């Protein structure tokens, strides 16, 4: 029993890296990465995996963080490094978006070029 009570954490803990702004993936499956560390991360804060994938810290648990992955989890392995970005989600807003087709994060997907807005909003 215990998510962070894995033998690797336990052995290198009894034996003797920044675990405040950085974590390591304990388990990844079905788009839910458990991350040990990230002690400074906020609830619903967006974090960055080693493969460029982003995640959202949805479960702040006493010994790990349940992060939901914004993509395909085939690019995330156990032991991967997870960094903080310090920010909640935000999307670009403005008049520059009219006529554009974007995805759920405000990235253009119609190939007409990147969005040219000036302001972002949570």
């Amino acid at each position: 029993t215990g998510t962070a009570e894995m033998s690797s954490i336990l052995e290198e803990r009894i034996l003797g890296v920044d675990l405040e702004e950085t974590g390591r993936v304990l388990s990844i499956g079905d788009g839910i990465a458990r991350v040990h560390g990230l002690r400074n991360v906020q609830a619903e804060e967006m974090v960055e995996f080693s493969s460029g994938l982003k995640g959202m810290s949805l479960n702040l648990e006493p010994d790990n963080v349940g992060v939901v992955v914004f993509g395909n989890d085939k690019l995330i392995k156990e032991g991967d490094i997870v960094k903080r970005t310090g920010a909640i989600v935000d999307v670009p807003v403005g008049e520059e978006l009219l006529g554009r087709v974007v995805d759920a994060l405000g990235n253009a997907i119609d190939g007409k070029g990147p969005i040219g807005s000036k302001t972002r909003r949570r």
Binding site: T1, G2, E5, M6, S7, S8, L10, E11, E12, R13, I14, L15
Partner: peptide, 12 residues
Amino acid sequence: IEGRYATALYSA
């Protein structure tokens, strides 16, 4: 838990 802790100790 017994095995996990003892395995950690042995591998240390």
